[PDB]
Amino acid sequence: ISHKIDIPDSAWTIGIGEKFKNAGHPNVKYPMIDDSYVQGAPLGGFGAGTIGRTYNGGFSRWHLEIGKNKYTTVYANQFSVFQKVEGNKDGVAQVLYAGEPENGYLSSWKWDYPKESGMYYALYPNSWYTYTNKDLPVQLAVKQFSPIIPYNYKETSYPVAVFKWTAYNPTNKNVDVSIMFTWQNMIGFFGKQVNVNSGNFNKIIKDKSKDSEIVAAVMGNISNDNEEWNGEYSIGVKKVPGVDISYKAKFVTTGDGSDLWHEFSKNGILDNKDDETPTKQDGIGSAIAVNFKLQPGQTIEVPFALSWDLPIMKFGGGDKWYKMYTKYFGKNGKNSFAILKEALNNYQKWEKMIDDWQKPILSNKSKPDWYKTALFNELYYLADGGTAWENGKVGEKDKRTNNMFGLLECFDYNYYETLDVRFYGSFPLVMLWPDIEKQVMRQFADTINVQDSSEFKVGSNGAMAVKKVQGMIPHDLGSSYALPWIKINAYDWQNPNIWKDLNSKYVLLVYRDYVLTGKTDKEFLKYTWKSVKTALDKLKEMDKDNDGIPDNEGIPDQTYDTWSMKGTSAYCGSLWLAALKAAQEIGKVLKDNEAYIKYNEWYKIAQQNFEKELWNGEYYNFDTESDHKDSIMADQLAGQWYADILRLGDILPKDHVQKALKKIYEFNVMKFENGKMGAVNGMRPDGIVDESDIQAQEVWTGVTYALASFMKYRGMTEEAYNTAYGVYKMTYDKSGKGYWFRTPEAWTKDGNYRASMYMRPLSIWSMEVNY
Ligand SMILES: *[C@H]1[C@H]([NH3+])[C@H](CO)[C@@H](O)[C@H](O)[C@H]1O
Ligand SMILES: [Ca+2]
Numbered sequence: 001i002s003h004k005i006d007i008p009d010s011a012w013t014i015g016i017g018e019k020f021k022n023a024g025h026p027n028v029k030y031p032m033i034d035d036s037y038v039q040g041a042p043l044g045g046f047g048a049g050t051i052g053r054t055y056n057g058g059f060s061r062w063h064l065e066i067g068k069n070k071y072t073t074v075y076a077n078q079f080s081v082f083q084k085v086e087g088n089k090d091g092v093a094q095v096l097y098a099g100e101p102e103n104g105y106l107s108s109w110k111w112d113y114p115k116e117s118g119m120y121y122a123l124y125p126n127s128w129y130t131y132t133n134k135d136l137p138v139q140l141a142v143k144q145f146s147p148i149i150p151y152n153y154k155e156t157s158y159p160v161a162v163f164k165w166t167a168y169n170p171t172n173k174n175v176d177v178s179i180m181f182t183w184q185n186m187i188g189f190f191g192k193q194v195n196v197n198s199g200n201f202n203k204i205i206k207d208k209s210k211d212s213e214i215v216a217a218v219m220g221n222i223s224n225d226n227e228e229w230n231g232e233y234s235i236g237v238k239k240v241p242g243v244d245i246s247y248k249a250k251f252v253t254t255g256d257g258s259d260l261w262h263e264f265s266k267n268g269i270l271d272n273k274d275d276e277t278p279t280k281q282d283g284i285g286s287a288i289a290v291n292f293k294l295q296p297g298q299t300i301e302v303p304f305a306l307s308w309d310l311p312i313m314k315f316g317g318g319d320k321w322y323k324m325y326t327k328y329f330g331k332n333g334k335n336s337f338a339i340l341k342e343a344l345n346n347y348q349k350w351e352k353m354i355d356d357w358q359k360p361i362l363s364n365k366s367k368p369d370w371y372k373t374a375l376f377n378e379l380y381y382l383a384d385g386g387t388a389w390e391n392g393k394v395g396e397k398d399k400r401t402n403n404m405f406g407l408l409e410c411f412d413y414n415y416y417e418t419l420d421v422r423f424y425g426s427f428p429l430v431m432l433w434p435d436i437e438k439q440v441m442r443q444f445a446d447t448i449n450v451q452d453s454s455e456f457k458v459g460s461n462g463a464m465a466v467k468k469v470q471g472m473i474p475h476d477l478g479s480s481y482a483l484p485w486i487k488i489n490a491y492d493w494q495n496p497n498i499w500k501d502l503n504s505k506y507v508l509l510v511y512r513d514y515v516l517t518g519k520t521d522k523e524f525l526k527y528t529w530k531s532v533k534t535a536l537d538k539l540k541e542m543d544k545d546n547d548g549i550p551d552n553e554g555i556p557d558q559t560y561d562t563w564s565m566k567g568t569s570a571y572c573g574s575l576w577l578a579a580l581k582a583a584q585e586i587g588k589v590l591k592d593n594e595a596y597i598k599y600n601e602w603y604k605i606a607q608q609n610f611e612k613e614l615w616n617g618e619y620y621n622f623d624t625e626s627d628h629k630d631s632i633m634a635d636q637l638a639g640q641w642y643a644d645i646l647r648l649g650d651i652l653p654k655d656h657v658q659k660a661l662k663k664i665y666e667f668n669v670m671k672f673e674n675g676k677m678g679a680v681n682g683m684r685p686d687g688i689v690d691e692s693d694i695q696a697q698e699v700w701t702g703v704t705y706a707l708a709s710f711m712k713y714r715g716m717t718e719e720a721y722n723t724a725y726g727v728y729k730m731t732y733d734k735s736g737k738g739y740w741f742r743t744p745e746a747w748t749k750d751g752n753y754r755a756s757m758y759m760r761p762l763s764i765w766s767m768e769v770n771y
């Protein structure tokens with residue numbers, strides 16, 4: 001069957017129903033998400049809410065409630081197959097799901113799709129399932145995707161998925177085949193406080209335009225309430241030559257399922273029974289099937305689709321917003337059929353658009369397949385990370401020009417656009433969706449001079465601190481449990497208003513976004529320039545010892561929020577140097593002589609003092625005053641890394657940078673499990689992992705990928721890919737820890753993890769920056 005479909009060799013692959021033996025688990029004491037290794041590539045566009053369908057076939061990882069992660073298989077949601085060989089009395093019917101319900105429902109359906117009988121493949125945004133089963137003479141495959149397309153802000157938003165089936169008969173008998181899509185009416189699955197199924201009902205739409213015929217089920221509710229819970233789901237199929245369509249509008253999901261299954265298992269043909277009766281307590285669902293006869297050697301292809309029109313997202317602080325796709329389909333929540341139809345009539349164009357964007361990388365035969373696997377599959381997080389993309393506040397009067405956006409750091413630390421993390425994680429956005437990236441950075445610019453003098457308890461030490469200080473960049477733009485975009489600085493473990501990295505990272509992200517979009521967007525530099533100057537001016541005030549560099553205060557006052565730095569640090573110091581160099585450049589572009597002169601003066605003093613304070617002959621010391629000061633830090637030259645990307649030249653001597661990178665490769669990579677797991681954060685110069693704090697002993701996936709890109713830029717090609725390979729292997733390989741489609745922030749040497757589904761590893765896209 002893989003002969004009749006084209007799956008790229010770089011697709012991640014696993015057997016349907018394969019048990020994975022090696023899997024990791026959280027390495028922390030507090031409760032932390034662990035949804036198991038049974039995952040797959042998500043379906044759904046940016047800001048739409050996403051649905052994770054796993055490699056076992058189940059629709060199990062629900063991100064439809066924006067900002068929340070709910071792992072539960074909705075067992076009624078499936079593809080099923082019927083096959084009957086010409087000359088047999090009976091056919092066979094089978095749910096394409098390698099599992100079964102726990103207790104109760106749908107006992108009549110044929111569960112437990114057998115092992116060693118099919119494969120799952122993923123190369124985001126595409127995934128595939130092949131079915132090669134000795135009791136199914138006709139072989140089947142499906143290609144499933146959403147239209148996630150760089151430089152496209154329309155289709156990329158859509159709450160839709162397409163399932164393109166291919167069926168091939170390798171035998172010498174005629175075989176009757178049916179494929180059935182079932183879906184529960186999930187209105188009330190979340191957001192509805194009482195009466196969760198009440199008023200749900202299903203209708204059948206038959207669209208008979210010539211050379212189209214679509215048949216679709218629309219699963220909605222009789223209420224017209226404008227609430228997060230209300231809207232519609234649709235499933236449907238497009239008629240193709242040689243296929244007939246059948247349907248069932250209403251079967252009971254909170255029952256044994258035999259209302260539907262006795263029809264399908266007989267002859268693969270449903271009753272075509274319409275029934276718009278609303279349910280009260282029972283759960284209900286719909287079914288759409290196709291049936292056809294395959295001659296020996298014959299192939300047939302048929303598309304199904306799924307859409308969800310859930311127009312309103314609500315956050316825990318009370319704000320309700322329309323999702324981005326509503327711009328294209330409307331806001332009233334009765335548009336699921338329009339969305340489905342658009343997909344069923346345009347999916348072939350979308351396939352080609354995805355192929356067109358993937359082709360430059362896939363066709364580059366100098367790059368290993370593993371690297372391609374990771375580059376594309378890490379992109380899952382852009383849609384799956386609780387992504388919020390608004391098209392107005394519900395009830396909003398004054399029209400607006402922009403659509404605010406946010407990606408979560410992760411689900412365990414439910415913070416939007418954590419700036420210290422996006423410094424690593426935002427590369428795909430600037431490179432592939434630059435209008436979104438510039439919007440986010442304008443969001444940050446707009447916060448710089450916000451002051452909120454109310455106080456909060458700091459988690460690390462119990463002291464009270466001001467929420468938001470004028471001139472200090474925020475850690476984050478809110479929490480999905482509170483008020484994204486409106487109440488910033490949701491994070492409370494430390495006080496980010498005294499952090500020594502955020503203001504620098506902010507400036508560097510600004511200049512990055514100018515450089516990587518062609519050095520043409522002077523208007524973006526003009527919008528952000530006051531905030532850039534304010535940010536550097538405020539951070540200068542933190543230089544207590546007058547060496548020209550902000551001083552770390554013997555506490556975790558930066559992204560390593562449990563790892564103390566004291567005095568001048570390699571990390572914050574290098575970031576400061578590069579940020580000064582960037583601001584000098586912007587000064588030149590914008591003809592701001594006083595800023596150029598001032599930042600140049602600050603840069604020259606700071607650069608001299610940084611080298612003297614920290615250069616030890618082999619690498620740059622972690623810091624000037626900590627007990628662990630001669631640790632080799634993987635991220636010690638983060639400022640120079642960004643300076644390379646920004647084309648700002650040498651902030652530090654080339655020979656010193658080279659020695660430092662070589663040391664990090666020889667130590668932090670190669671002496672940490674033989675370089676097979678990434679770069680550990682801190683290593684002592686005797687070749688022993690630094691145990692001064694948990695973070696020192698962790699590999700950070702996104703720091704590792706960033707380090708790899710830096711090594712690549714500096715011509716250490718073999719070291720770069722070796723360093724990155726460890727992250728790929730841990731994430732995706734049979735020898736790793738089973739983290740596919742949930743890449744975590746960190747792991748320790750035992751392979752166990754902290755914070756699955758994390759933003760930072762999107763930094764693998766920095767390996768694709770083109771000089
Ligand atoms: C999320 C998390 N604590 C990390 C460390 O893993 C930190 O960098 C972020 O600032 C925090 O919000
Ligand atoms: Ca200082």
Ligand SMILES: [Cl-]
């Ligand atoms: Cl290997």
